[PDB]
Design a protein around this ligand. Structure first.
Ligand SMILES: Nc1ncnc2c1ncn2[C@@H]1O[C@H](COP(=O)(O)OP(=O)(O)OP(=O)(O)O)[C@@H](O)[C@H]1O
Ligand SMILES: Nc1ncnc2c1ncn2[C@@H]1O[C@H](COP(=O)(O)OP(=O)(O)O)[C@@H](O)[C@H]1O
Ligand SMILES: Nc1ncnc2c1ncn2[C@@H]1O[C@H](COP(=O)(O)OP(=O)(O)O)[C@@H](O)[C@H]1O
Lengths: 120, 757, 817, 241
């Protein structure tokens, strides 16, 4: 703003920010659709650690894993904020990190299944 | 692990830092021991004892103890194991013989009271605290004993032996890793490694680093030696930092022959890149202390042929020159006392002095086998070695006077007599006797025959100077150990709050008035109160902003950010320091000094407000507290000149030191307090040499009198008045009368001076 | 080419190209001589411009060759240049021989005739007469010591001291009466040298030295001239201590003599010892202690020319490299000033090159590799490096050090007072030096304050000038009533403290703020008790000021009356114009500086009859290259800059402007970028040096001033080198502004008369509101208490108010129409 | 202000300075009531609502400028330029609407307020504050209107499906942009993008600004959130290279 006034004089700005919990949940569901985490043995816990706002009242296994992924991303953000508060050096945690996490999940699940389900 | 770690790492340390690392090792092993208590509180006090704030009434003034000893006793008495220290000191009778004993640390009495018997390490740490409190000079020797108690008696025994190049180079060093031989200025380590190579029948290539052609020879030599396996040498590589960085990156990607050895001899300066220091083994070389060692080094450096020339007295002159150079160089270690600053009395000035001696001896004695001692151009050598050589670096007037004193005492026709005293009362009645020989060999035998008990009295300084150096090194080791061991904002808030409580609240400006304006003392004091009030308001506002940030209600701006950084690191903010301050002073000491100065300025302000200029003249003021003291002396001179209708230049300053109670406030007299005289004692305005570190002057009267236009008596000595113990500010010069049988030259040599604080 | 006769190798590739392509037109070669010769600014030829008749200094002193050099016989540039240099050296040697013989005739005499002495002084150069006096005194002392070699004998050295005393007396008599400026400088230098010789002879007498080989005599700089020596260069050998230097005999020209204080004597001894041991010396110390000029005077005294570099942040290699290796080839000394200011890489490069040349010089105790070239290094080389606190690590073992902690300002003042002809000079010095110490310490710190040794020198020179002016005034008075004229009688009955006080107040009071004036008065009362002064207020100039203010509608006041402060400031500006050529009108914007000089110019025009026109130049708005002049990189064409153009116009005397008074005022901010070129003009040399080498002499009637609002960022050299007047805001109170507004409205019509009557009526109606402590003044005082989006300036509000009242008058005019 | 340097006192002496501050609430009401009266002539049946509408825009603008001060964020500046942009956008939206009830006017007004004073916010709490306060202002100045239709939470305006810039439902917009994204995959770089409602809002805003001449953006957000991807998508879809 100080160096260049035109960037704030007439140019409009849009605050993308970061993907919300809803966005992360949608990414997790859409990306992790090929993998089959449909587990009938799943039982609904008395306490469910909800982090997605519109989570269906009965959590399915796929809903549970996507919710856990969003929770993991939120805990990374919280830990990064805590290190920032403590004064230690910090590195931003981008949604690209979440995409890479989903891709690595897909890869690990695919390889472990491809071997040990062949053994199945 | 412990022994090899200390032996390897200390090889790359200055000798003054070996004890710090040994103490760190002892602390690590103490923590490692499971049965031994942590001693966290004991070490906490041993490192941070000086930070405890005391009061005048907090010192009961125990007989037989100095004031500093008194605060040291009372501050350490806070420990639960040392609560009964006062009564035991009062009751004990052997305490007197122990306090002034030569080595009190060897037989420290059992004072601390405990419920259960102490471990030997606990006894050692208790005695260490006792030594630090009572005799801080012996702190180094007691730390050595403590480490020996922890890590074995012979832990440091390896350091005293000369460093064995053969084993450290043959094995335990990688050919890729360069050997860094870092020496302090005035020492070359090439001889050791050259003798190593000669004894190990290895052809070594030595190339100096002075120009791009030197870079070329270095590159070709290393490229040959990497494959051939010979040893290669680079000298004075501190001249080229960027090229040294390039050499480091070259050595990073290189696999040499098993016998390849890259030696880097260099001077210890910060310009050396960090990467080489991290990627190479470092060895530190220092010149051994001792006048004997310096004389031996000087004699070895000079070729034997030059000393033995046609005039047989040239050897005598060279010996006198070598002794003088040893005396000057050794006084450097005692920097606050021996001189005013760390001059660079290197080898080059010694070479120039030898050249001057040769030229003048050849000119005076034109190819004569013998020459009469009186015919020697003594005046020529004295003046040349006072002004051109050894004096060009001398900036202070009093240092140049000291150099004149040394040259007059040493370089004289009376030196050539067998009864000449090269030094006086080095230890009681005994004094150094100059050799009667006429050739170099007898002088070499004499210097190799010195008792090696080189007390500071050899240099002419008082024998307590070595104790002062030991105390300074002890405080240095304390500081280094302290540096070796979010909550930071909380403790910063705590210290800011305490300082805000300590510092006075405001300062009141003086009331301007025309007759006060005419008075010069009022002008000086109103300038002083203006400066003090402005700086006090700035400091108070800065502390208030710091506290405001501490609760988080204020954001840390760039000015606030740098101030917070300085406070956390303990370095004084540049904004706070507007008056001259000793360089080594820490923030807490600066705050205490500022508080005392504001207290004095409040006193002077209320005194001026109660009366006026007439009462302002008759005030006793400490010059150390005043921001600009020479302004105060000038103001007193102006006041007396205006009062007596005399011109300013025709006035001279006289000093009458008396007790505060038994003093007369004449029309031309101004009271001065806080002056401390070091190196002597003054009674009835007569100086007397003493071994005391400093004698506080009760009350100094500054009297301005008309110029008598009479030469000062031979018993009149001029003493500098420094602002602080650093001796960086020359405020003015006083004139005192010495007692009978006293030598003003001895006063000059012992560094007697008056200190504002 | 340049290898042979390396004396012209100082100049660059540019000047080499011009001197090669333009060898025939010798009239255009003066620039190269000005670059490379010391004082010689021009070469004297005949009408045919084919034979070298003589050389001329920048001041005007000329030296004619005994055997002129003919350029036609030696068409080659280097050959005839070498002949010119050799002829100059040999002719200076012949002049030195004649002058030393003449002064030896003057020597060993009970009394001397002033007329013959002045004739001898005029015959030879200042450098030549100083050297002749030094050899005469040295030979006298050597003879006296040779007679004293017996020991325990009557001392004729007392007679030598008495001879020095009597010639010093005739010098002190010769300076009171008016003398030409060149002869005045000669007398000043000669008095300085004779004072030093008298002091050292007194020291020798007190020491009772009886041997010529005694070191107390050897430590003094002794001069040995050998007429029998066949080589003119080796005829004069300078000896001090164990070191030897052959006098170079280069024409250093009439320069500023440097007095040899004991600090300077120690510097001489240290540098001489360093040179004998074949290594340079480093006179480190704080700035303003004479570190550079000690080296310069040592070079001047040995007949060597020194190159004083400026080691600023913006420093060059190629010009530095060529000039420095030119020193290496020539053998002339080169001095570095503020060697620490150089950047680290700059530092390392210069340290490496000087290390190589120094080790080569020690090897000579011969060529060295320089700029990928072999350079013949003469034995007579010296390289001196001044620093402000350390020496680079590669040079610590190659150079001797020396501390310039403090000059002996007391002796400095004493010797300069006695040079100006002041009696009781010791008392005046012992008063003035502590007085400036008090001024430096006790007075309030200001950016524009400068109370250094240069201030002492300028003040004392001005004191000498005003004392001479008072002597002339008393002489004219004595010729108008009575006839018995005796300069000694006027000197005796003339007081001296009052003149020094008046000079101090004339040179310094204009630079003080309003608060510091009583402080300065108290300092005068403390140092000079019971003695006071009255400024000679220019009553005729006061009448001219009141008339010019009436016609320019400005007010006029006297003393405490409305406008008195501004009138006094104008008078001080006139005084500083009289006693200086470079002015510094400093003060907050709105202090009235513009008409503070405009009204003064108009008053001087209407009083003295000398019409004046001012050239108001803005330096920051224009480009510096266009300000001073541009030199094309390729076509090498020189186009005069604006300041250069106006100087060329003023010198050309096209329309009689030399008779005219002219004021080139540099209104606008000043920064140490353009004024560095002007650092050649504010000095008493008074000339502008252009990059092409052409220099323009500053005409006496040209006065240059810089209407700068603040001097926070200007260098101290510019501050010290020009007179400066402070214009505090309190000089202009709002009442003057109101009165000027009312007069401007009343007399001049607004359109360019009915509406003039309108303006008069309106001004009459609002007269009660614009009086002192009126409605407007109170509104302004309350308004200043408020806050504003921009910085609040009084004249901003006043100008807006006046413009809006003018709009009201226009509205009245339109309504009436 | 940052990036602004104080001027020379010598220069200021000759130059008077007048402080042209922000227009007062009464001045804003007058000027934008004139604009709104000129605005609503296109729809005569809706002309009578100009006076309360202008008052509502002024009231919301006043509290937005008192709330999001420059201290909180460097880009939190409010000026009559913003409300002029509001007026221009509302006129552009009402131009194609030959007929419209008051509910549509309220919807467009809320849409433009969200696109102007709600995007620059950084904190979710600030955005929720803006939504609550726009609801309060709309109900305060238009009491005789239904909340569900006039201020339906999915305020999505697009000209992609319909010819005009009339409000669009989020689901139909999502389907259309999904088809366009499939075309984007088959033609341009094939990177899978999921379509959450934030993408819908962002792409609508980006296309809106690109459609407007001299459309210049300052995309601010954590790297990898999709700023460049969405910019490329909009540029390709609008034909911009
Ligand atoms: N003697 C006087 N009588 C009346 N008015 C005066 C007098 N002297 C100055 N002024 C007024 O004061 C102002 C001085 O203007 P001037 O341009 O000289 O200011 P300055 O101090 O040189 O400022 P700057 O640095 O901006 O040039 C003018 O408005 C002028 O009319
Ligand atoms: N010995 C001296 N005699 C006369 N004037 C001196 C002497 N020393 C210094 N000065 C004056 O003081 C100033 C010193 O300037 P300079 O030599 O540049 O100081 P430095 O060398 O410390 O930077 C000059 O104006 C000079 O006229
Ligand atoms: N709506 C979305 N759904 C899924 N992935 C997305 C979405 N938007 C962006 N991405 C991912 O972001 C990546 C590109 O990031 P990019 O837009 O270049 O970062 P930035 O926004 O910092 O410029 C793509 O690989 C893409 O997978």
């Amino acid at each position: 703003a100080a160096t260049s006034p035109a960037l704030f004089n007439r140019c409009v700005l849009n605050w993308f920010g970061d993907w919300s919990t809803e966005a992360l949940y949608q990414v997790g569901k859409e990306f992790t659709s090929k993998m089959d985490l449909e587990k009938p043995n799943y039982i609904v816990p008395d306490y469910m650690p909800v982090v997605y706002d519109k989570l269906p009242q009965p959590p399915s296994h796929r809903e549970a894993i996507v919710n856990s992924c969003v929770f993991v991303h939120q805990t990374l953000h919280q830990a990064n904020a805590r290190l920032a508060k403590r004064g230690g050096r910090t590195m931003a945690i981008t949604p690209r990190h979440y995409l890479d996490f989903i891709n690595h999940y897909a890869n690990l699940f695919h390889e472990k299944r491809s071997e040990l389900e062949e053994q199945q | 692990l412990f022994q090899v770690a200390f032996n390897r790492v200390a090889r790359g340390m200055l000798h003054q830092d070996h004890i710090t690392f040994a103490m760190l090792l002892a602390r690590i092993k103490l923590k490692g021991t499971v049965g031994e208590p942590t001693y966290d509180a004991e070490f906490q006090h041993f490192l941070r004892g000086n930070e405890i704030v005391l009061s005048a009434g907090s010192t009961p003034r125990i007989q037989g103890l100095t004031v500093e000893q008194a605060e040291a006793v009372v501050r350490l008495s806070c420990l639960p194991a040392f609560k009964d220290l006062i009564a035991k000191v009062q009751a004990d009778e052997q305490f007197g013989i122990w306090l002034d004993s030569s080595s009190p640390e060897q037989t420290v009495p059992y004072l601390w009271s405990e419920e259960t018997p102490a471990t030997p390490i606990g006894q050692a740490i208790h005695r260490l605290l006792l030594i630090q409190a009572f005799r801080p000079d012996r702190l180094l020797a007691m730390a050595h004993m403590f480490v020996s108690t922890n890590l074995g008696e012979s832990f440091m025994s390896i350091m005293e032996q000369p460093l064995d190049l053969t084993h450290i180079v043959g094995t335990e060093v990688k050919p890729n890793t360069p050997v860094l031989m870092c020496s302090v200025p005035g020492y070359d380590a090439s001889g050791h490694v050259e003798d190593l190579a000669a004894e190990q029948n290895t052809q070594i290539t030595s190339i100096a680093i002075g120009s791009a052609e030197g870079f070329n020879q270095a590159d070709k030599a290393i490229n040959t030696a990497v494959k051939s396996g010979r040893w290669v040498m680079l000298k004075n590589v501190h001249l080229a930092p960027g090229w040294l960085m390039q050499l480091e990156k070259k050595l990073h990607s290189l696999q040499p022959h098993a016998c390849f050895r890259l030696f880097l001899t260099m001077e210890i300066n910060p310009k050396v890149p960090v990467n080489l220091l991290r990627a190479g083994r470092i060895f530190v070389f220092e010149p051994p202390p001792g006048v004997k060692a310096n004389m031996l080094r000087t004699f070895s450096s000079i070729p034997v042929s030059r000393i033995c020339k046609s005039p047989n007295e040239r050897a005598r002159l060279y010996f006198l020159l070598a002794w003088f150079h040893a005396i000057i160089q050794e006084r450097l270690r005692y920097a606050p006392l021996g001189w005013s600053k760390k001059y660079e009395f290197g080898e080059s000035d010694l070479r120039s002095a030898c050249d001057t001696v040769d030229t003048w001896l050849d000119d005076t004695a034109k190819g004569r086998q013998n020459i009469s001692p009186d015919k020697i151009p003594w005046s020529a050598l004295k003046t040349l070695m006072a002004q051109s050589i050894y004096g060009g670096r001398v900036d202070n007037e009093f240092d140049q006077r000291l150099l004149n004193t040394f040259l007059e005492r040493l370089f004289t026709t009376r030196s050539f007599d067998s009864e000449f005293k090269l030094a006086c009362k080095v230890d009681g009645h005994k004094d150094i006797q100059m050799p009667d020989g006429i050739r170099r060999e007898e002088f070499v035998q004499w210097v190799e025959l010195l008792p090696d008990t080189q007390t500071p009295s050899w240099l002419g300084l008082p024998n307590n100077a070595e104790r002062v150096l030991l105390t300074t090194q002890g405080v240095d080791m304390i500081s280094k150990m302290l540096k070796m061991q979010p909550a930071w904002m909380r403790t910063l808030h705590t210290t800011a709050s305490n300082w805000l409580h300590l510092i006075p609240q405001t300062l009141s400006h003086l009331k301007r008035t025309v007759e006060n304006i005419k008075d010069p003392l009022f002008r000086f004091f109103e300038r002083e109160v203006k400066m003090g009030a402005k700086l006090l308001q700035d400091v108070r506002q800065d502390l208030a902003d710091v506290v405001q940030v501490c609760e988080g209600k204020k954001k840390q701006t760039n000015y606030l950010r740098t101030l917070i950084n300085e406070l956390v690191k303990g370095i004084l903010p540049r904004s706070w320091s507007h008056y001259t301050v000793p360089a080594g002073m820490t923030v807490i000491q600066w705050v205490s000094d500022f508080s005392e100065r504001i207290k004095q300025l409040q006193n002077i302000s209320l005194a001026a407000a109660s009366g006026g200029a007439k009462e302002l003249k008759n005030i006793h003021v400490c010059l150390g507290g005043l921001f600009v003291p020479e302004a105060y002396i000038t103001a007193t001179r102006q006041y007396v000149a205006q009062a007596n209708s005399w011109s300013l230049e025709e006035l001279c300053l006289e000093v009458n030191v008396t007790t505060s109670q038994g003093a007369t406030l004449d029309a031309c007299s101004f009271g001065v307090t806080g002056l401390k005289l070091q190196g002597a004692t003054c009674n009835n305005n007569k100086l007397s040499l003493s071994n005391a570190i400093s004698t506080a002057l009760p009350l100094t009267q500054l009297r301005w009198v008309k110029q008598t236009n009479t030469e000062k008596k031979a018993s009149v000595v001029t003493l500098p008045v420094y602002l602080n113990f650093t001796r960086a500010d020359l405020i003015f010069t006083v004139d005192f009368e010495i007692a009978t049988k006293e030598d003003p030259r001895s006063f000059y040599e012992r560094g007697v001076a008056v200190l504002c604080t | 080419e340049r290898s042979s006769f390396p004396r012209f190798y100082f100049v660059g590739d540019e000047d080499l190209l011009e001197i090669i392509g333009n060898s025939k037109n010798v009239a255009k070669l003066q620039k190269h001589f000005k670059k490379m010769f010391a004082g010689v600014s021009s070469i004297i030829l005949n009408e045919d411009n084919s034979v070298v008749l003589g050389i001329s200094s920048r001041e005007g002193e000329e030296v004619m060759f005994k055997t002129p050099v003919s350029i036609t016989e030696h068409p080659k540039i280097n050959e005839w240049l070498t002949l010119v240099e050799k002829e100059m050296r040999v002719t200076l040697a012949k002049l030195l021989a004649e002058s030393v013989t003449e002064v030896e005739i003057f020597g060993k005499a009970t009394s001397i005739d002033p007329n013959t002495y002045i004739t001898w002084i005029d015959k030879y150069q200042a450098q030549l007469v100083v050297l002749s006096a030094q050899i005469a005194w040295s030979e006298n002392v050597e003879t006296a010591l040779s007679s004293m070699g017996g020991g325990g004998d009557a001392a004729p050295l007392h007679s030598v001291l008495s001879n020095v005393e009597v010639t010093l007396n005739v010098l002190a008599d010769s300076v009171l009466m008016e003398q030409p400026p060149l002869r005045r400088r000669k007398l000043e230098h000669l008095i300085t040298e004779l004072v030093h010789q008298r002091d050292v002879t007194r020291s020798l007498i007190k020491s009772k030295i009886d041997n010529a080989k005694s070191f107390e005599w050897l430590s003094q700089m002794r001069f040995y001239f050998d007429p029998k020596q066949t080589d003119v260069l080796q005829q004069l050998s300078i000896q001090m201590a164990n070191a030897k230097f052959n006098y170079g005999f280069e024409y250093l020209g009439v320069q500023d003599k440097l007095v040899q204080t004991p600090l300077t004597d120690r510097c001489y001894l240290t540098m001489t010892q360093a040179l004998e041991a074949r290594l340079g010396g480093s006179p480190f110390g704080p700035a303003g202690t004479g570190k550079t000029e000690s080296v310069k005077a040592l070079g001047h005294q040995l007949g060597r020319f020194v190159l004083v570099f400026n080691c600023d942040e913006t420093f060059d290699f190629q010009a530095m490299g060529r000039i420095f290796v030119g020193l290496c080839q020539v053998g002339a000394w080169g001095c570095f000033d503020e060697f620490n200011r150089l950047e680290e890489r700059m530092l390392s490069a210069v340290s490496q090159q000087v290390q190589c040349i120094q080790e080569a010089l020690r090897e000579h105790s011969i060529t060295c590799e320089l700029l990928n070239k072999q350079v013949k290094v003469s034995p007579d080389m010296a390289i001196f490096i001044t620093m402000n606190p350390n020496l680079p690590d590669n040079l610590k073992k190659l150079f001797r050090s020396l501390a310039m902690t403090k000059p002996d300002r007391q002796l400095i003042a004493q010797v300069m007072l006695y040079s100006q002809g002041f009696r009781t000079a010791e008392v005046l010095a012992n008063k003035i030096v502590p007085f400036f110490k008090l001024c430096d310490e006790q007075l309030s710190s200001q950016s524009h304050y400068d109370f250094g040794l240069r201030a002492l020198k300028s003040v004392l020179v001005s004191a000498g000038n005003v004392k001479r002016e008072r002597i002339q005034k008393i002489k004219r008075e004595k010729e108008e009533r009575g006839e018995a004229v005796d300069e000694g009688e006027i000197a005796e009955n003339l007081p001296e403290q009052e003149i020094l006080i008046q000079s101090v107040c004339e040179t310094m009071v204009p630079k003080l703020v309003a608060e510091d004036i009583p402080l300065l008065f108290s300092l005068l009362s403390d140092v000079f008790p019971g003695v006071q002064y009255h400024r000679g207020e220019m009553t005729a100039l006061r009448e001219e000021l009141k008339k010019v203010c009436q016609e320019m509608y400005l007010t006029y006041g006297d003393g405490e009356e409305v406008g008195g402060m501004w009138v006094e400031k104008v008078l001080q500006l006139y005084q500083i114009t009289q006693i200086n050529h470079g002015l510094m009108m400093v003060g907050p914007s709105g202090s009235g500086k513009s008409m503070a000089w405009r009204v003064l110019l108009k008053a001087l025009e209407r009083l003295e009859g000398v019409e004046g026109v001012a050239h108001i130049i803005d330096p920051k708005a224009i480009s510096k290259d266009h300000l001073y002049g541009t030199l094309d990189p390729n076509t090498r064409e020189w186009t005069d800059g604006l300041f250069t153009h106006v100087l060329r116009k003023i010198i050309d005397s096209v329309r009689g402007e030399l008779q005219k008074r002219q004021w080139i005022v540099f209104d606008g901010d000043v920064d140490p970028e353009w004024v560095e070129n002007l650092n050649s003009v504010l000095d008493d040399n008074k000339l502008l040096t252009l990059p092409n080498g052409e220099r323009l002499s500053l005409p006496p009637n040209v006065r240059i001033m810089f209407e700068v609002q603040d001097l926070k960022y200007a260098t101290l050299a510019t501050v010290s080198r020009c007179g400066m007047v402070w214009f505090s805001e309190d000089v202009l109170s709002t009442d003057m502004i109101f009165n000027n507004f009312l007069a401007r409205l009343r007399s001049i019509p607004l359109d360019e008369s009915p509406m003039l009557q309108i303006q008069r009526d309106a001004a009459t109606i609002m007269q009660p509101y614009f009086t002192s402590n009126g409605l407007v003044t109170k509104a302004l005082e309350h308004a200043f208490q408020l806050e504003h989006i921009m910085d609040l300036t009084r004249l901003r509000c006043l100008g807006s108010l006046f413009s809006m009242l003018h709009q009201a008058c226009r509205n009245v005019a339109q309504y009436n129409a | 202000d940052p990036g602004r340097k104080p001027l020379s006192h010598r220069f200021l002496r000759h130059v008077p300075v007048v402080y042209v501050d922000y227009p007062g609430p009464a001045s804003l009401t007058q000027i934008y009531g004139t604009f709104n009266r000129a605005m609503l002539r296109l729809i005569p049946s809706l002309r009578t609502y100009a006076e309360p509408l202008t008052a509502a825009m002024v009231e919301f603008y006043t509290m937005s400028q008192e709330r999001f001060t420059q201290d909180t964020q460097p880009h939190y500046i409010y000026s009559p330029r913003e409300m002029t942009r509001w007026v221009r956008g509302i006129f552009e939206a009402l131009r194609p609407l030959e007929t419209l009830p008051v509910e549509g006017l309220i919807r467009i007004w809320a849409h433009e307020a969200l696109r102007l004073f709600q995007d620059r916010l950084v904190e979710d709490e600030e955005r929720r504050w803006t939504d609550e306060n726009i609801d309060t202002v709309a109900l305060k100045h238009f009491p005789n209107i239904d909340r569900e239709k006039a201020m339906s939470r999915p305020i999505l305006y697009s000209n992609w499906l319909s010819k005009d810039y009339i409000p669009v439902d989020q689901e139909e917009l999502r389907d259309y942009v999904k088809a366009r994204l499939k075309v984007f995959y088959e033609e341009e770089l094939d990177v899978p993008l999921v379509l959450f409602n934030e993408v819908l809002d962002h792409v609508l805003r980006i296309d809106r600004i690109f459609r407007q001449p001299q459309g210049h953006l300052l995309l601010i957000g954590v790297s990898g959130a999709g700023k460049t991807t969405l910019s490329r998508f909009v540029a390709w879809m609008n034909g911009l290279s």
